[PDB]
Subunit: 367 residues, 4 copies
Amino acid sequence: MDRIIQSPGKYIQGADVINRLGEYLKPLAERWLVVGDKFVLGFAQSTVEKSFKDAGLVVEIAPFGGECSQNEIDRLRGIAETAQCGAILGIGGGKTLDTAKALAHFMGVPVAIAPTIASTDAPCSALSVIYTDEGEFDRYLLLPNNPNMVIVDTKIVAGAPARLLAAGIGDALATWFEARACSRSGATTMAGGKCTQAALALAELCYNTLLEEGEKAMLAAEQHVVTPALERVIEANTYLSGVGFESGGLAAAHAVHNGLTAIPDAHHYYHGEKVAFGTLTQLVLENAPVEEIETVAALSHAVGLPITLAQLDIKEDVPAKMRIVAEAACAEGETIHNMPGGATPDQVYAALLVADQYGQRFLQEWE
Amino acid sequence: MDRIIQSPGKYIQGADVINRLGEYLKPLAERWLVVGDKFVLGFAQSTVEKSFKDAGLVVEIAPFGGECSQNEIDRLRGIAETAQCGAILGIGGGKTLDTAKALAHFMGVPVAIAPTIASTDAPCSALSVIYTDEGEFDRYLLLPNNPNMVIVDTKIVAGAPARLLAAGIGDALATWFEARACSRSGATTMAGGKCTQAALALAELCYNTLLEEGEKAMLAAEQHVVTPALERVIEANTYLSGVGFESGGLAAAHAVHNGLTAIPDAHHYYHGEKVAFGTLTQLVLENAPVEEIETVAALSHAVGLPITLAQLDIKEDVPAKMRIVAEAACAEGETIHNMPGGATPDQVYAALLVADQYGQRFLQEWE
Amino acid sequence: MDRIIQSPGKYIQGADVINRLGEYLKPLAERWLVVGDKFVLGFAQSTVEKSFKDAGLVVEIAPFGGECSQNEIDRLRGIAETAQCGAILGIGGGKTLDTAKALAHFMGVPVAIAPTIASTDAPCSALSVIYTDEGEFDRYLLLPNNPNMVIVDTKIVAGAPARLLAAGIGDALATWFEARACSRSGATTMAGGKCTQAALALAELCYNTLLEEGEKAMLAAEQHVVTPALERVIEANTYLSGVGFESGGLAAAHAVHNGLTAIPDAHHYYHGEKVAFGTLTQLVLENAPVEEIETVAALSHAVGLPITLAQLDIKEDVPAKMRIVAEAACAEGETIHNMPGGATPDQVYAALLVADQYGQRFLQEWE
Amino acid sequence: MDRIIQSPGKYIQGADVINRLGEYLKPLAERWLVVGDKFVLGFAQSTVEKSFKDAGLVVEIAPFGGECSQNEIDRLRGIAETAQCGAILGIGGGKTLDTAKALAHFMGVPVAIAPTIASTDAPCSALSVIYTDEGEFDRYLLLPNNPNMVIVDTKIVAGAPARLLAAGIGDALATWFEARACSRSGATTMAGGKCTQAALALAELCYNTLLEEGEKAMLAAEQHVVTPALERVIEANTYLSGVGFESGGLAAAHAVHNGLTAIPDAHHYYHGEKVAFGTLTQLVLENAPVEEIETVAALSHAVGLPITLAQLDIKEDVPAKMRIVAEAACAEGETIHNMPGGATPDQVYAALLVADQYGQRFLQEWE
Ligand SMILES: [Cl-]
Ligand SMILES: [Zn+2]
Ligand SMILES: [Zn+2]
Ligand SMILES: [Zn+2]
Ligand SMILES: [Zn+2]
Ligand SMILES: [Zn+2]
């Protein structure tokens, strides 16, 4: 099979980089649609407009409905054709960014993505998740290519709630272990081939960056300031983790995340916070060595990620609920089948309970 | 400053991947111009055509004149506009690929790049070098983005003379040392910012891939067969080295290469062969440890790359010529100024003579 | 002297392997006597019968008396002769399996052994422990060969009380230290020769498997689920430990176990729980380094095995009782004479008291 | 699936152990057929007769036709039924032993196997290779169980030509690399399951034994004397390698051996001599690190095994012949499909030529 790696065309990261959006985006189009929800436009709209003006570009700002629905994409398509936009610039969190990527696809124009948080590794990916106007799952829209540009303002991200950075860390912490599993098993990545040497290097670089920089970065995030450690974790949460997961492979950790949403208890927890426990479950499933499990559990704990089912508010019908999680994780077409032996629901069920036990014993020892 | 990494959107590599050109390219355009190297088309045109047809695409094959001149670009522009092509596919050596990238830029269409040799790391880069019809240098054409897709057929590459693989190795062997030098000095990369963690990991991965796989890969190249060592060295010569140099930084090795072209003696040697000696000169200039010089020298010699001036046919007015090489390498806007502390023409002159001296003594131990 | 290793002809292990007894045993005989106690036949008879039926085999269920006595073997010999059995299948715990192996010997037929717990390393051995009709130890019965097949259902073993897995770990934890002692001293194994390289490799693998997988396997055991760590400790408790002790050697640890049954206080503790303290006694006796004593004590404690006399309910009049244990351990024909240099009852006495002190100081250091 | 390891019931090796056949074999049967090569009986028949007689056993000597054909098995079956033999003892080389094992199977009696050379790992296996009277291949006879006893007289083996010990080393050297390959890919062993930990430990112990003991053992082999190093290599060549391959897995090395017999040039070379080059081919195919390739090539050369096609007298029309070898090695039901990711005939062809290059380069350097 072919070895494939895909990447956004340009990834840019720096403090106060929105001031420089105009010069960065000019080579792609002269007239831009700028999609942002009201909260994000609150602090950035002044700066976006100034940057485009000084650069000689025309901007047409369109406040974002808040949900990534086919209706909202169609709605913005109208405004954009009316204002004769040559590209879309999405700015904000995950759903606002997915909307920009889907819109720019249907219109056949380039897209720029400016995350205002580093809480998932979705931004750089060639994937948009579409919902109905009212918020239920609808379809996956796999896109022909990754965002043309990704611009991350590290000062904006430092301003966000620290819990969102740690959720991002939890998301990126799975990257290495799922890419490694797909390499061991010969699985196909979401880029359509086997692992390049490049993708595995970026996946492992992700994990080591979190080990070396996570706690230092959280200190900065809690103070809402920018230090070089925060810079590195943002790159790891965003570019490394994005290319890592998409061109390196997904496996049990994310299948387990999907299983955890198939029950209501953990609705109030972020994507990356569920993956955190998914990674620990995968380590039990593949029987990672004790030193590796402890390292992942310690790092997760150090940044506030859950390492037990109770810390995801799953406290009541635990056997019954884990049986649902396990069946969901092993559903047809789920990525847990990329694990080396494959995985049966009985096996995933076992890992779920054991990972939970392991986390409980860890919390009572380390404090 | 901002940290920037740029990449082609999708990099694909595999044996006989030419059979799959059609499916890989369909998501980009329905109508394709193929700028093709005459030797490549000689044996492959039927196969390219069948690949496009089976995918439901219409293709217009255009044999390439051999030089990347404004005349040749204009001539191909006509053919493409007549045939109403939405994208350009270059397939062949460096000049074919540079022509496809320039053509696609002037037309404002996506471009796909299919190297049939792995002798430089230019294919993935956002740069095209334009000449006059008779091969004299004319100008640089910096492109706003990297090729949309790069597709490398390893079986086609294995057919080329092994000297071309080794030239590629010499080109890629410099990557780590120049990106590392730029990181030490805070220099700006060709992507316009400081180096990301990602680019440095790919640059160092490149170097280690060459150390571990170069001699094994050369064995396969000399038999024109495909082994996993060859696959990895092709990825290093192409994706790792391209992203490494462009987003990691250039320094003395390439500057010394340019200086070596300021004299006639080594005109008949490939780019990567002159870079090979540039890397040894940089190692003297930055006073790399002796183990490191020895490792780079041993690997270079093991794959037939020059490690002395005489092996580039520089045998006569060596001081006078090295004086020219040094002055040229230190010209304004040359990348030697990215070395920590910079480099004066007197310092580069000394490094040249000492590296040559070091290479000669290494050869005398018949290694 | 000759180097000899003995092994069962086939060892099979898996989840729900009970379903596959028929196809696994078909090549050995067509008509099978199945020996099982009422409790085991309770949950397993239905499944065994279906497995034999579907495979084209004849089964004869023979409920087991509960004691491995000469008279009980003779009784089953009669039942077997009547039903014209070509093979024996024992399926309960230890006494069931010993009875099946001896019966098959006197009958001159193959035997398959299906343990439903992994709590001792006897299953694979060419040995049956014989009692009187009223339950007193009578003699060891050496068999000419090891069981023809051993089939371990990992799901059945996961269902059993976790305390039994820990006893199995305690039993298997001694294997490396006693085989290593016999190798150092040149002692003869129960297989009749000196150590093969093979048996020493399997004994040390056993120890390292417990070291790496013991705590992970106990988490799965306490939840009655199957994880790859549990799979590994089952193989270690059963095959590795079995071939290790029989073809690797016994020494002080088992001598001390036998001595510990020469007093009533520890009647309520399993074989492996007493062996666990025997291993610590041997480590004091052979003056292992403190790192080795501590590693064994920590692993023992981490899975709930005793590392003090008090944890074997030996709390009253300890000096007098240890004298009896020591004298018993040094009886004629005991394996403590395999220690390098032998051991006197005074020496074993001192080792017992000091090992007890060591365990106590360890428990006082906060678990 | 299931973890399965199969083994002979008892493996014995020692100097002059044929003196002790009687006491070792008596517990299995009272009346023995001894199948023996005329040359082997030449020096051994008197000693065998005394050993069985002194032990109270009855023996019936049956000189062996030399070929393991159904006609010859039937001829010996007759003699055995007439003399009312309860078990078979084969004593000689490979054909004698395969004949004894098949005969014992058809008769449903135990078999004892006494190799007089240690040149393959077949003796301990549950497999017999049947030919026609005139030496052309007929069928494989998979046996329900491994030999009951294997007895290796190390002094008899020391008397054999040293080339045969080296052939045994070449055969045993592949064990680790093929078992490791099957473990990486989850292939099924010839024992019907996935790898036990035990079998991988024996396969790796085999490899390390050859590295540490191979050259010392060859010194003793050339003087026809017994040293502890020779004993360890015999155990490695016989028990470790046998259990390793059958319960650990076969892969490219043996597929490549089979392909090499598909051409006439190497008819005068022993099984293990061809396997030696098969291992090197596998190392190229799976892209083993150079240190590993060099270690295997160096050890192979140190004991006289071939590391080039010319050393197997394959010197003419080499590409044409290697294409035959490659196609044969990938035929349906060959073990090359156990390699991670499989291997196509083109990939094996490439490995063959490159491994040949590597061997040639090694011979002219490290001679
Ligand atoms: Cl035309
Ligand atoms: Zn995620
Ligand atoms: Zn270059
Ligand atoms: Zn050049
Ligand atoms: Zn025991
Ligand atoms: Zn073999």
